[PDB]
Amino acid sequence: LQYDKPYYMLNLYDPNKYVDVNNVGIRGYMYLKGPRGSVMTTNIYLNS
């Protein structure tokens, strides 16, 4: 793991959800939402 290197977030409890911000400010918060989507190329690979 390295500093100054953007990373996307994943949670081990609920992989299907990803991190998003509701709003920016004091009253804002961070939350999880889905579905993760899927990238597929037929007969070779299919992953979230």
Add this chain to the structure above:
Amino acid sequence: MKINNNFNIDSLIDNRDVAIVRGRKTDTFFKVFQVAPNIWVAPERYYGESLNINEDQKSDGGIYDSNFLLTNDEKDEFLQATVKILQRINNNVIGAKLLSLISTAIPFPYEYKPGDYRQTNYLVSKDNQHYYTANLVIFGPGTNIVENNAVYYKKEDSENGMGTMSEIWFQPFLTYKYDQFYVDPALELIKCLIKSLYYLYGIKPSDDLSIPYRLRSEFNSLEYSELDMVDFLISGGTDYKLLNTNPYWFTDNYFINAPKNFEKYKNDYETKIKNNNDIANSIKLYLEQKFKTNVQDIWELNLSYFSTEFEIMMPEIFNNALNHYHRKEYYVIDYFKNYNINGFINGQIKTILLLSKYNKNIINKPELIVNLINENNSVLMKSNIYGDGLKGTIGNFYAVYKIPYNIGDEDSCLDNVDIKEIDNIPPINDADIYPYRKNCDPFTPVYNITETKEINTTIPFPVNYLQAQVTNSNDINLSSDFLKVISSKDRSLVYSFLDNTIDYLDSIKYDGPIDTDKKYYLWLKEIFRNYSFDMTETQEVNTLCGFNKVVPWLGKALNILNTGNSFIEEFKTLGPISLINKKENITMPKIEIDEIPNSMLNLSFKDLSENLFNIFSKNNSYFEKIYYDFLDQWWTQYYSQYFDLICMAKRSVLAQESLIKKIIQKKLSYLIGNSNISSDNLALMNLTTTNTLRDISNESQIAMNNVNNFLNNVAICVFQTNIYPKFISFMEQCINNINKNTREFIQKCTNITENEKLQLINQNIFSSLDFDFLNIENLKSLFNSETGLLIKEETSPYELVLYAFQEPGNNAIGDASGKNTSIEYSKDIGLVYGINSDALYLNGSNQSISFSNDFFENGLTNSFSIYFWLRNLGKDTIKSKLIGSKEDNCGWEIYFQDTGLVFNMIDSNGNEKNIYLSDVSNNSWHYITISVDRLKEQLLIFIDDNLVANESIKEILNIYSSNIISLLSENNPSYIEGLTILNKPTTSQEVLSNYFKVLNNSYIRDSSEERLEYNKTYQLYNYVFSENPIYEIKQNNNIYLTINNLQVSKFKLLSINPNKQYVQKLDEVIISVLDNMEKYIDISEDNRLQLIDNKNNAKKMIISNDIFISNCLTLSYNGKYICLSMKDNWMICNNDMSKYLYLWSFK
């Protein structure tokens, strides 16, 4: 949602929430209470089944009481219990979503005329002027009071997507104990609710659709017990893991048709109904919410998911065929005493339930009667083997099923459900309900008629041994001859396999009577130790599959290979496959593979290659499906017998445990009644015998886990050595044929050149790399489950693990072990960082902590361990108490004394183990561990990581003390961190691992074991010269640091960032010396350590150390460390000397 708990059996009828309705079309009427929108409870027996039925019409394993739920008090109890379970389920988020879904999953209205819809879900009042909307009504049980069930209002309407009402038979008062826990009735209610979901969405399968469950290996005939589709889809367990595979090896037309019908009725609603004003908007909203969740979501709901979400322990292996394995025993649950919103009060294991009166009424009609007979056909032994209530077919399902070559394969189970949206829907009033007359099928009770057959055997079967190991006599002689046990006409002996315990009892057969409590303690301890060495003993053996924990007593527990000298020798010379009866059971699945289409002959090279690639992918997927089918077949055929062995062995262990407890209790009662022992000694004897029985239970659980793991491994190895080679051979033939066909097809193509023909031929071959699906981790991970994790954490050896931290406002201190240990601590105890976490700071006068836990009382035969981090800040030689449990001079304790510690163990009889530990109180952290092992009778004391004491406590009897462990640390302020008490003895390897694991947290420690930090005035020392500090002296117009074989130099570390406080491993440092003006370090040309004044000229060294050493850090620069120089003694940056020279320390 809000469950209405303000209803009693005598509430007045309001025509809205509580009413009296009619079941089906019969003239029977009953009272119902609406608990939540569209869900009602009928606190009465089910009207459809007659309360009394003929004796031969009784279902085996079922309890029949026609007087149950009869009086109004029983009905009110049922109502309150059901409402309490409803509240418990609703409190959890997933249970609340399930309840909202059931509340909104109304059956589809029936279009009597185009544009005219009539409801199907309705209840008719007594005089037939009030109609009630209800998706589900929960009744009491039918004829059998333990038969929870759910039935549909109309068959066809619930089969073709329209949906019907559901009616539930529920038994909230009875539960059964599986292994070591009581099954939560909330989970059974959840299972019935999910079945009601299947009924409400009209996705009920055809009755003939049923996947196989077990192979009836008890019979001498080939027969498969197959489980219904809904039961398999919603039961969960390990069996559901052999069907829910990606890709699906088992598929049926039902899984295609059901979404079709769902979408059809969704279109019917959204086109015809949603735009129709003929019906109330309530039905519109209910249907909108019903159709918002598809059929896949309903399919993925099963008891494994709810067990994980609700944290409920459930059966996980063959959980729908328990009536053959687990002859249940029933316990009554008092919902005001033994239940609350959080399930069983004090867990599913630690709660106590009164045995139900109905256990004697359990009907026992066995599917088989096994009769052990001798040469002259005399009936020696007789036993009953029970069925499972599952349809048994005579045809092999695996040899008839056709794995679909052509199929299409593509979140939270109820993520789309909105509880708030469903709650906001106003209810359906009585004045806007137009019923449909033929909405109810005529209910017919179904009676299962079991068949009984006999078998005569010359060799005892496992059930013969299992039944011969139980007895009702209270004067038990544990014998060692099953033939003699059966032949014993006196009915006195009872069969057993505990050779150590039997031999010990034979040795003290002529021993003098136990007159005093000391002899009783000696006898009880010896009996416990012999029992634990008989039961928990295992032996590692190397078989054709690996290292396995062979448990030797199974041969004498289940009559498995008693012919040979020992169980292990037979297990090795015969292999795993010998542990079962029916060993050649695998048949080749019926498989069809589409040949290459001829229309591709006139295709270009690229298109032909792409089609061949698609064929290759489909063939690989088909081979994977064949492997999944083989895996399921191996389970259902071979692991069924091994799990029969598992359950039989666990039952044998429980029988032996009960026999031993009988012996203990009879001896204790005889001593109480026929001895001159003082009364207080009798009271303490009873209190100690209780704890000894608890420890015996724990040892039994250990043995059960051992046999479980051993047989699981044996079954996996059977799959290795017997099923996979057959799969490999069949797949080799199949790939050979497919390669031949593809090669011929390519050679027959016309639009392809010869070189391209060779290219395509070699590109689309099949070899062993395509059907090599074996994966040991998946085969051993089938048996992992949420039940296993919950049992593991509930029976965790950690009785106490103190955790401490600082929250803005206060400091939190407590137990993190999950047990019932209560903590009462003086609120003037601060927390300061110790080694890895916070540590309690004790003044030594008024700071007290008290840990209350039953196990802390200790006893005669409980092994335990105490370890922690101690840093004394005192100098008192007086024997001052530090920590321990001491009631009436009896117990264990540890006091400060001199500059070290004293460990004291005093039993009731006066025997005292007093040990002294030197050099412990030095303003430095020490990792103290004590391990009292009552099995081998060993006392181990470790300081830091050295075995400082290894004594024998063979002469220490009962040390029963108070449940309170008190941390006082008299007269010495001190730091105490990571206090931990386990109920298991600790070995040296575990102590070393814990020591290094806690220490190795990427922190740099000085000589005081504390945390080194920046901007702190330390003093440098060498590991070799720890007694000799570092001095600064002027020479050659410079200043140099050296030892003497001189003003001691003051050392500080500096970091680049001013936001860093402590010094972590593997980081840059600038060494600084405090002179009249501060100076920094540098390395000169001769690698000597020079003192400079320039701020930026000083270069950055690197700090590291070895994890094997607590605090001997090393300073390096550009790959070359700093080491002591030759005598002349300064420091040099050279690596042509011994390793000890690089080591350093700070103070």
